[PDB]
Amino acid sequence: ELQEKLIAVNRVSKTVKGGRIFSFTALTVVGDGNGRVGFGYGKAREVPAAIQKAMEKARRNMINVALNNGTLQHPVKGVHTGSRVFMQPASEGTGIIAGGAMRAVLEVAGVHNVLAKAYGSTNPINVVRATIDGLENMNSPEMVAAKRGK
RNA sequence: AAUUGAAGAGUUUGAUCAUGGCUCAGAUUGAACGCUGGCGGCAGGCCUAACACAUGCAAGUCGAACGGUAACAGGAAGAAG
Numbered sequence: 583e584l585q586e587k588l589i590a591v592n593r594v595s596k597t598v599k600g601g602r603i604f605s606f607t608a609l610t611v612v613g614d615g616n617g618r619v620g621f622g623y624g625k626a627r628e629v630p631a632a633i634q635k636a637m638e639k640a641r642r643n644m645i646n647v648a649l650n651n652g653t654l655q656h657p658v659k660g661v662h663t664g665s666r667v668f669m670q671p672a673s674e675g676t677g678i679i680a681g682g683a684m685r686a687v688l689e690v691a692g693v694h695n696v697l698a699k700a701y702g703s704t705n706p707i708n709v710v711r712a713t714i715d716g717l718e719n720m721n722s723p724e725m726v727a728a729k730r731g732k
Numbered sequence: 733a734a735u736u737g738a739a740g741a742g743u744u745u746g747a748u749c750a751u752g753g754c755u756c757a758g759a760u761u762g763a764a765c766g767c768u769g770g771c772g773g774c775a776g777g778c779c780u781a782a783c784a785c786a787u788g789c790a791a792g793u794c795g796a797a798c799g800g801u802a803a804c805a806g807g808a809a810g811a812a813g
């Protein structure tokens with residue numbers, strides 16, 4: 583069964599003529615724990631509800647990745663907007679070593695051990711999906727062997 | 733057998749994304765200060781005035797190199813209570 587995790591919940595203001603109205607935005611990541619991971623960004627005027635919305639959207643935007651064992655193939659660089667990401671497969675008995683929301687994304691995607699680092703802005707929203715871009719463009723030996731033989 | 737290696741957070745805005753500074757979570761020391769203080773092992777102990785120094789000790793040893801009896805530990809002769 584899928585597992586879901588909540589990264590952060592924020593508050594945003596609209597300052598209408600009448601006054602100031604506050605809304606809540608939630609970011610969540612869902613995944614099967616083997617190959618499939620997705621993220622959702624929901625909003626609402628109450629917390630519990632925004633979370634719900636997010637989950638729904640995440641489930642419907644899962645993506646697939648190839649994982650040599652519980653680890654990546656090769657080092658990959660992820661970039662989006664203003665957040666750079668770097669990851670290394672590392673050995674097996676090392677645990678997960680990552681920062682804010684990278685632990686969430688990788689654990690949900692099913693990476694039991696990896697070395698990760700974030701450069702530039704650390705904005706949960708960008709860092710999420712910046713990791714996922716790298717996992718997207720990761721190339722596996724099986725799909726690179728389509729060139730010829732092995 | 734002797735390469736098992738990399739975490740971030742707070743803070744500018746009504747709110748957002750950047751840029752950019754400040755601050756914190758770690759480790760370490762020949763440390764000092766405050767409160768407190770049972771024992772043991774190993775190590776350490778003037779980082780400032782190469783400023784000035786009372787007192788004691790820290791370079792002596794060879795008679796199997798040679799003249800010698802100033803100490804005195806023996807012996808012999810001689811003079812003697």
Ligand SMILES: [Mg+2]
Nearest residue numbers: 701702703704
């Ligand atoms: Mg920055």
Ligand SMILES: [Mg+2]
Nearest residue numbers: 789790791792
């Ligand atoms: Mg002496």
